Structure formats: C-alpha cells, structure tokens
Subunit: 54 residues, 4 copies
C-alpha cells in the first residue's frame, strides 16, 4: 500500500532520471556542434587579421 | 579591403549562427530546470510517505 | 524494507538538488555568453557597415 | 587611410571577443561534463534502489 505506492514512485523517478540524462546528452551534443562553428569563426578571424597585416 | 569587407561580413553571419544556437541551448536548460523541479517534488513526496512506514 | 529505501531515496533527493543547482549555474553562464555575443554582433555590424562605404 | 585605421582597431577587437566566446563555451562544456558525471551517480543509485524493490 504505502509500499505499493513507494514502488510506483521509485519506478517513476527512474523514468524521469533517465529523461534528465538524455536531455543533458542532447545539450552536450548541441554544445559540441556549437564548438565546431566557433572553431571555424576563430580561423576566419585569424585569417582576416593576418591579411590586414599584409 | 574588398577582401576585408567580405571576410568581416562572413564572420558576422557566423556570429549570428553561434548566437542563435547559444539561445536554443539556453532554452533547453530552462526546460530541463522545470523538469528537475518536478523530479525534486516527487522525491520529497516519496520520502514523506516512507517516513510514515 | 522501508528504512533502507528511505535512505536511498533521501540520498537521491540530495543529488537531484545538486543537479538542479548545477543546471541553473550553466543557464546563467549561457545568459552572460548570450549578452557578450550581442556586443560582438553589434561590433561586427558597425565594422561591416563602415567597410561598405 | 582613416577609414582603414578604425577598421583595423575594430577587427582586432572582434578577434579578442571571439576568443572570449571560445573560452566561455569551453568552460560550459567542462561544466556540462561535471553535471553529466553527477547524473550518472544518481542513475546508478536509482538503478540500485529499483533492483532492490523488484523482488
């Protein structure tokens, strides 16, 4: 009863904890994509600076 | 100069793509925060019943 | 058994809270990043406009 | 001449600010790995609690 509802709750926490994990992994992937775009922008910046010195 | 204009205009586009992505990420975290709050509540309610047992 | 379960759930609720806190820190960092990218976009926009003329 | 001068300054500032944006995102990446580590410990505690009530 109390133990039944406790088992339902622990199962439901387990579901929501896996969903929190999955959401963080998605966010990590998005940040990785972002990091790559930033790489490209830094190269382009260094190139523009270099040419202003030439 | 013309080449400088071109590279600067390209950077400005790329800065915009990075800005937009940062905000999409910011919004995911906002939404995750809300879901954590409800998980926090479910854990508190589970513990309260366990104390009576 | 209720007592050991109570103990594992309590420890979960403390860790859930720590996760929640770290999420909100990361969120604040995105907001400041967002604002610094806004400054940079403004700069790139000014630079680009002068270089047209 | 003059137009170019200011432009050189502006471009020099953009590349400082682009570096900062980089550094910030590197920090966020590291903060997200910590967070993900914490979530793994909670998934583990949650799985053990579950394993222990199945039967």
């Amino acid at each position: 009863a109390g133990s039944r509802v406790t088992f339902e709750r622990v199962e439901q926490m387990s579901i929501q904890i896996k969903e929190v994990g999955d959401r963080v992994n998605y966010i990590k992937r998005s940040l990785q994509s972002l990091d790559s775009q930033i790489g490209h922008l830094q190269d382009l910046s260094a190139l523009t600076v270099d040419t202003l010195k030439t």
